[PDB]
Symmetry: D2
Subunit: 155 residues, 4 copies
């Protein structure tokens, strides 16, 4: 079949925050682990279940800074700008309804606080490195290094 | 990230032949597990390691009967026919270079026998069911219910 | 840009039922042309313009017989079965929520009759033939050799 | 059925360089029209027929300036950088083998000169606009507002 790992994939060293606000590296996540998610509409946090993990590799990645704290993923990531109230990407697929993510846009923290993007750069690796896409039921999002990231595998 | 699973996917029940010819359900297989692979060009068997497992859901499936034996997978699969010397799918995507898999075509067993397909059926579930795709390192193939299948995770 | 042509493509000598009631070979269809379409919802016939025509190649085709007439197309077509009230393909994509088209299933005639599928055959050409995908406005369906086929390009 | 438009698509008023060095708006190009092309290995200009035009729509677009002149396209374009000798994209797919396109990278003019990229913007539009992918035989490339662009209609 054809899968759309939409919201992209994160490097092994990326930290996912649990329902108990603890942190584990995405490559140590397992089916049924309970992670901190966010209802956009109801404007409230809530625990949800990891259904699926997909492991790929890539040599071409994207670093986003939001203060001293950063995150490394594919260019087809999806993050929430709570000030803009839009899902955004550096590289959105034509006809997804996702806005362009830019330098000095906002991300939503795992404490629901607005964080300002300080820098956005491309990043190649000498050889390919592992990347991970996790699916979360109902909310379909989580917190990668403490900011709200959407993730869904479809088709 | 748009990921093409080339071999399609198999129901959780599907038996995988391990390097040492023991059987393991595909929903038990873990990264690093050593599976009975096959070098097509060389016509020689080989042990190889699983690097990736992908789980998705489907309620539209395909049952290939080859005598009394059978395998249940997605309709876009890739089984090797050792008579025609071709990888075959019941439902090839246009201009993919995969031939139609038809009634009375041949599959390759884990021993290296030619096994004849006696029936191809559609199978529908009233609930979506879990399906599994395994990436094998070098030869990117394995024995599903005793017959040779290709599988590959490819980025687009 | 990745473009899913929902409804597949038809060979050159496939007959399209025009607005003007006459038949026309799909390889002659031009943008603006008005074809006979159907509203499944309204259960009435309508005239709609062709907004887009994709042309491609293939050597692997699907023949569907209904009475003493047939249609030739890619295996990932989409036809309406009026008996079941479902869109069907011989080869549906798992995710698509499309049902299997089978022997003795029904198609909808351009005059709203239920015609029985007598034979479905998968065949090859010695070298590729041109296949055509036509998008139709608002209804997104037309009549191929007198039976109702869906077609819609999306990203 | 599933069709990858490798090379993205251009806005209707984008200019295509014809074989005789005349210009035509891409939204007027027709099957059999002759366009200017480049062989990278031969490092010479060829003339080729357009075999296929695919028309879609988009609200997310990309503008690339090379001095006074610009080109507007989808973010999954492919332009030849003749300085680094690589096909490039603002937004390449993780496994495509395509480098990133950035400020102060180069493009190849329809007369064979390096043209420096001076600006890359990404802009939403409020209503979707028409966009056009064209298939050129043999070289699968053409000149879009005077710079070398790749385009190919491939099944998955
Ligand atoms: Ca069984
Ligand atoms: Hg980036
Ligand atoms: Hg089948
Ligand atoms: Hg068929
Ligand atoms: Hg851009």
């Amino acid at each position: 079949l054809i899968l759309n790992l939409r919201g992209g994939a994160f490097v092994s060293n990326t930290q996912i925050t649990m329902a108990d606000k603890q942190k584990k590296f995405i490559n140590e996540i397992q089916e049924g682990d309970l992670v901190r998610s966010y209802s956009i509409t109801d404007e409230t946090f809530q625990q949800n279940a990891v259904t699926s993990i997909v492991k790929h590799e890539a040599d071409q990645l994207c670093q986003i800074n939001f203060g001293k704290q950063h995150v490394v993923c594919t260019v087809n990531h999806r993050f929430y700008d709570p000030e803009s109230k839009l899902w955004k990407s550096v590289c959105p697929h034509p006809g997804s309804g996702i806005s362009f993510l830019k330098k000095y846009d906002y991300l939503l923290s795992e404490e629901g606080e607005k964080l300002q993007i300080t820098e956005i750069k491309t990043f190649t690796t000498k050889q390919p490195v592992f990347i991970y896409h996790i699916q979360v039921e109902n909310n379909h999002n989580f917190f990668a290094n403490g900011v709200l990231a959407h993730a869904m595998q479809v088709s």
